[PDB]
Design a binder for these strands. Sequence first.
DNA 1: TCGCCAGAGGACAGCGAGTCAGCAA
RNA 2: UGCUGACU
Lengths: 45, 50, 64, 58, 1123, 50
Amino acid sequence: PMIYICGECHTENEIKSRDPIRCRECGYRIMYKKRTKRLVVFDAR
Amino acid sequence: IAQLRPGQEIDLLMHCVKGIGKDHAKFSPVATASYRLLPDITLLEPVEGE
Amino acid sequence: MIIPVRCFTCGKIVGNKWEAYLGLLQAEYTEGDALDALGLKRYCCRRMLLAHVDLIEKLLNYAP
Amino acid sequence: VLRLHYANCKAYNADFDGDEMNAHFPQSELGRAEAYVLACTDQQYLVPKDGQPLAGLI
Amino acid sequence: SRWRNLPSGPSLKHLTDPSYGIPREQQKAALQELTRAHVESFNYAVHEGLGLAVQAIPPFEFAFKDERISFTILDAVISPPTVPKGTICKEANVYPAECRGRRSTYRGKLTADINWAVNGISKGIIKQFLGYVPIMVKSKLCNLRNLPPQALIEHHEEAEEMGGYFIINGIEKVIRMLIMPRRNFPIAMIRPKWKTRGPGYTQYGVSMHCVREEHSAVNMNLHYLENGTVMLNFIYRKELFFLPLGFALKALVSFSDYQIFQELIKGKEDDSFLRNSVSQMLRIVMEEGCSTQKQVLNYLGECFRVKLNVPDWYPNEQAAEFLFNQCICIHLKSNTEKFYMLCLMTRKLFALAKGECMEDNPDSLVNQEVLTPGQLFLMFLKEKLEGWLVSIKIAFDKKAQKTSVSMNTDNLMRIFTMGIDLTKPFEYLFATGNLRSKTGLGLLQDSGLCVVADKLNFIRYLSHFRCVHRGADFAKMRTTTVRRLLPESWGFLCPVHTPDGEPCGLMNHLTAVCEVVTQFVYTASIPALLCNLGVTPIDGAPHRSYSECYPVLLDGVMVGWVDKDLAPGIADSLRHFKVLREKRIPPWMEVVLIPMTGKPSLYPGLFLFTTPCRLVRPVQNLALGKEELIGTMEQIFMNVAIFEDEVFAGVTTHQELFPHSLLSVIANFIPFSDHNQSPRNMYQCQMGKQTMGFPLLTYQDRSDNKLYRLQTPQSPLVRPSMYDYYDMDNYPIGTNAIVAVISYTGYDMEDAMIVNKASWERGFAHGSVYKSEFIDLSEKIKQGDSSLVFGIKPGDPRVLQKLDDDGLPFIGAKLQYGDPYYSYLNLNTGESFVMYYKSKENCVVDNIKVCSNDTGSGKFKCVCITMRVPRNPTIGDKFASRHGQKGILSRLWPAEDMPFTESGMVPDILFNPHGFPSRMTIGMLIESMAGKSAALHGLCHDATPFIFSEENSALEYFGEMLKAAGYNFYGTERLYSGISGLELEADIFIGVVYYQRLRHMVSDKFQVRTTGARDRVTNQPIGGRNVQGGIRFGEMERDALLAHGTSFLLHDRLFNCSDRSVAHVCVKCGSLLSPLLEKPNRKYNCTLCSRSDTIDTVSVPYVFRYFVAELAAMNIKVKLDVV
Amino acid sequence: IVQDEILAHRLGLIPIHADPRLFEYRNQGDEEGTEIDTLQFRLQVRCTRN
DNA sequence: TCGCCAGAGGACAGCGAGTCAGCAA
RNA sequence: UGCUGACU
Ligand SMILES: [Mg+2]
Ligand SMILES: [Zn+2]
Ligand SMILES: [Zn+2]
Ligand SMILES: [Zn+2]
C-alpha cells in the first residue's frame, strides 16, 4: 500500500516494480511519496 | 503553534523536564529581572519664570 | 514565517498577541497605540510584532 | 574554529572576517624540537625586515 | 510615466492588512519590467525575426548526377512545448513546473517546410521537422503566458514570476546582456597593433559592426596605409581578407572614376594629398586591368571564388555579388547605399589620419550597445538552418548521384536523413555556454554566453536580468582601462554595483530607470520627413560647400548633408516629435548632433539611431515636461539637473526623474548609502547576494541542488522607499537586532561580533538548507536488462527498518552517515544493493519525487530525494549589516553576563566600536537611531539616499525623534555591567539595526586530513574537500619555512607526508630504470649489466621517479651518484 | 507546513504552569522518565472543511 | 668590397597565494 | 579535465 500523490491531480496512485510511472485520472509524470505514521524523536533545543 | 489547511494533520507527544535558564533560555522563569539605582536630582538654584 | 513565540532579546511571550494586534489595527488604532494596548513596553518587544512578516499565509496557498 | 590570540594577528594579517588558516602537525620528534626552538612564536617577536617588533596589543 | 505611483516614503501597514494572503488579480508590473528586455527580445526572435531569418537563407542549389536541384525554406515555425507525440494522455500542454521536478529542457518543436525543385518546373513542398529549440518561460511560445497570479499558483509557479530565463535540464540558464561595440555606426579607432596587418599599414582605422534584422552580424575594418591609400578588411568564416578600396567602390556602383572621387573629397575639396591619394586608389589598382563594373566584379570573383566556396556553375560576376551580400555592409539592401556608407567611413579615416578628429574610445558607453537573448538565439538559429541545408545536400550529393527521376520517391526519406541534426547543437550553447560556430556570429566571445541563474535570494536572482558583461576576455589583461567607470555611464550603469574581485569593472549593472530598447518599427517615412525638415538628399545641390554641412545618417543609411545653420533646428524639431509622439518618430529615436568647430573634436554630423539594442533612460524634458528618453550618446550634449533649484534658464535642457536614478536596483536597497564610504557600498551590494533569506514560496516542487532558507525573516524598520515599490517583503532577507556599540568582551575585536546566547536560543537567525539529490539509476548499468527499480528484496537484514519496501527512506526520517539510503533490485538476477548515506551531517528526508520518462512510460528508475539540514548560527558563521560590516560570530555571550540597560533591556548583538574609524560607515550609526525611533514610535522611516541635506541633517531628525520618546538626542543609553553589577562610566550607543546572515558557514569550510586517497600519478594527497583531500603547502610556504633554518620541518612536510618511496638503483650504472625483479630468492638484477650485487635501495620521492621515467621517454638519461 | 525541528523548537519555548518545586531532575540518560521527573502533553489536531 | 657600428623586426616567455562548489564534456 | 560562480 505504498501511496504516491499526483503532481496536480492529487490522486493516490500505488506503483510497483515493472510498471510505468504515470498517474491515473491524468497522465502526469511526477508523483510525490506520502508521509505515513512512523515515530520520530526531536529535541526542543 | 501552527496553521493548517484541509487534509493536514499534527500528532505528537511532548516531554517536559526540569532545568535552569542557564543551560537553555526556555527554562528561564522571568521576562526580565533587571534593577536600576535610584536617581537623585538636586536644584542648586531656584528655577523660576518660564 | 509564523509569529515568534518569545521575544528574542528578552524572552517575553509575544506569540499570543498576533491576532489581538491584527484585531486592534482593523479597529482604527495606530501601530503605536496598538503595541501599547498589548503591553509591549520596551522597543525590543515592539519590533517583534511591528516588523513581523506573516509568510505562513502565503505558503498555505499552494496545493496540499 | 581554530582560536588564536590577537597579538599574533599583525604577524599573519588575519582579520576575523572569514579567514581560513592551515595547521600542520609535525610527526617526527625532530621537527618538534625545531618548532619549539626555532619556529616558536616568541622568537618571532621582531620582524626580520627592520628588526622592529611584530607582536603587540591592538 | 512607468515611474509614477512610486512610494513617497515606505509604509508598514501592508503587512497586517486583512488581504495579505489573497493572491492578487494581476501581477506586480514593476517586477515585470525587470526581465522585460529578456522576454521582448525572444518574442521577436521566435515569431517576427524567424521569418526574416529564413527569408535570407539563399536557396541551396547543388548538382545531383547531371542535374541541378534547388532547395528553399519558405517558413519555419516554433511551437509551444507539448507532450511528445500523442503517446501521452489528458493534457497536451507542458508547464515549466515540471522539468524542474523532472530534470528536463522546456523545448518547443521547430519545423520548416522546404521546397525542392529540379530546374524550377518540377517542385514539391515537403514539411520537415527540424528539431527542438528551448523556450523562455513567459515568452509567447510558453504555456504560462496570459495567466493571472491566482491561476499561476495552481500550476506550481511563483505568482510573482517574470521568466526571462531558459530551463536547460532544470537549471534556469539566464543568458545575460553582453556588450557589443555598436551597430551600423562607424567608430574611428587608433589601435597600434594594426600596422602589423601588412607592409605599409598605419595605426588608424574605422571599424563598423553591421547587423541585418538581428539575424546577421559582420565586422568590416577600413585601414589607412601610409601611401594615403585605404584598404578594407572583411572576415568570412573566421579568415581575414584584404581588398583595396576602389575594387570595392567600382564593383558596388556603375559610376565614373571622377564621380566616385568627387564623393570621397566631399568636405576637403581643397586638400591635395587627399585628392592625389584618391586618384591612386582608383587608378593604381583598378586601371590596372578592370575599368567596367563587370570586369571588376569578374576579377574580384576569380580571386575570392576558392574561399567563398561558391557553386562551380556560377559566373565569376555572380560569385562577386555573393561576397558583397554576405561580407560587407550586411545592413543595407542597395549597393548604391552600401557605396555611400563605405565613402563616409573613408571620409572619416582621412579626418582621423590628418588629426582633424578624435579617436572614438571603444570603452565608452557612447560607442557601445547590448547583445540581448533574442539576437543570440536567432543568429544561432539562422546559422544552424543554413548548416542543416548544407548537410542534407551533402548526404544528397554523396548517396548515389542516380537518376533523380524515380528518386523523387525517396526525397522525403532523403531530407529526413539529415533532419536528424538541429536538436543537440542548440542545447550545447545553452547547457555549456560556449559557442561552436563556423562564423563567431560577429561576437568576439565564444564562452560564458549563458550562465546559471541561482535563486539563493531574490536579490541574487533579480541581478542576473540587469547584469551587463563588458566581455569574458577582458578578465585576462595587464592594463586596466576597461575598469574605469567613466562619467558617460551616468544613469545607465550603477557606480556601486560591480563585483569586487577579479570581475571588478567588467560586470556592471543597469540603473533602475535604465532600459534596453527592443521594439522594431517601420522607419520608412523618416527619410522623407528629414527632407521636409531641411536635409538635402545624398544626390545633390547641398546649397553650401560640403564643409559647412553636417552629414545626416539614419541607421547606417546616409540621408545626407543637412545645412550647418539648419542642423540645430532640425535636431530640436525631431526631439519635439519623439517627446510628443508626433509623426512616426519612435518614442526612443536618438537625435544626436555632434557639433563641428575647428578643434579636433569627435567627427561632426547629425546621427539618428532607432535600432533595437541601445540603452535608454527617462529624463523629465524641461520646456515640455513630457518625460523624454535619452541614450548613451545623446546624453553627452545636454545638461540634466538632478535637484530643482539646480535648473537654470539657458542651461539645464533636461532634468532627471528622481535624485537616486543613478543607482542600481540593489544599490537602492542599502539604507543611507550617502553617509558610508564607497568601497563599503560595493561590498554591501556583493553581500546582499550571498545572504541566507527567503528564496521562494514553492518548496516541494523545485528540486534544486542547495537552497538556503531563513526561518523567521523580518522587514527592516528603516528601509528605502524603493524597497516598497518592488515588494521585497514577499521575500525578506534578515532580522532586526538590538545592537550596542560597546567594547565589553575581548572576543569582538578585529571584525568579530558577539551574539547573546538567549537570543540565539529563542530563535534568532535560525535557518536550514535543502539538499535535493536526483538519483537517476540508468547509471550503474548500460543498455542491458533493467538493473534499475527502487526496491527491497523481502527481509534484507541491511534495510530491516530504514527503508519502506520501495528502497526509499521514509518521508520525515532522519539520515546519518552509514544509514541505508536506497535499494535497487536487478530485476533479472534478483539482487539488491543498499547504497548507504555517506554525508557526515544529519538531515531529515522531507520529500521524494518519483519521475517518469516524458512519455509517461518510465519504469521506477529516476527519483529526487530532498534532505533538510538545520543550519543554526554557530561560532564561525558570517553575519553582516546593510553597510558592508561583515564579521564572524566569535562568542555566544550568556544572557546574564550581557550589559543590561536602565530600561531592563539587554542587547543581542555586540559590535566593537573600532570598525567605524577606518571604514567610515556613518550609515550604521544613523540606521541604529532610525530603527530605534521606529520601534519606539511604531513608525517606518525611509533611508533613501540624498533625502537629508546639510541643513536638514539625519542625526538632527532622528535625535529629535528619540528625544520625543524620552530617550536622549545622541542615541546613547547608559548600561550596567552584567558581570560586576556597576553602572559603566561611559554611556553606550544602542539601537536597532537589520542584520543579514551570510551563506558561508564553518560547517562548509573546515577540513582535517590524516591519511587517505592519493593521486596515482604522483602518489600524493588528492586535493579536495568533498574528497578527503590534502591542503597544499606551496612554494611561498616552502621558502618561508627554510628562512627559519628548520630543514627538518621542511623534510617532514614535503617528504615524509606527501610522497616518500624506496626506489632502488644500480650503484655502478647509477640508473633508476635499470634494476628489474625476477621470476619466483627474489633478486633485483640490473638489466644493462647482469650483476645483482650492485643494486641498492635509495629513499627518494615518487614524483622524482615519475620525472626520471618521463625523461627516459625523451631519451634523456638521469645518472645519479649513490653514496 | 511547519517543519518537525521548527515545531519542536516552537514547542520548547511554550511556558508550562507546573511548579518546578514538586519535580526533580532527570538522571543523565534517563530517556524514559517517571512520575517523579517528567510531564507529558499531546497535541493531535486535523483540519477539515466544515 | 663586405665587417662591424648601427639598424630593423620577429619570437618567446613571464604574468600572487591558497580555498570551495556546480555543471558538463 | 575545463568553464562558470564564490572566499581572504
Ligand atoms: Mg579578512
Ligand atoms: Zn493525477
Ligand atoms: Zn522583549
Ligand atoms: Zn648495472
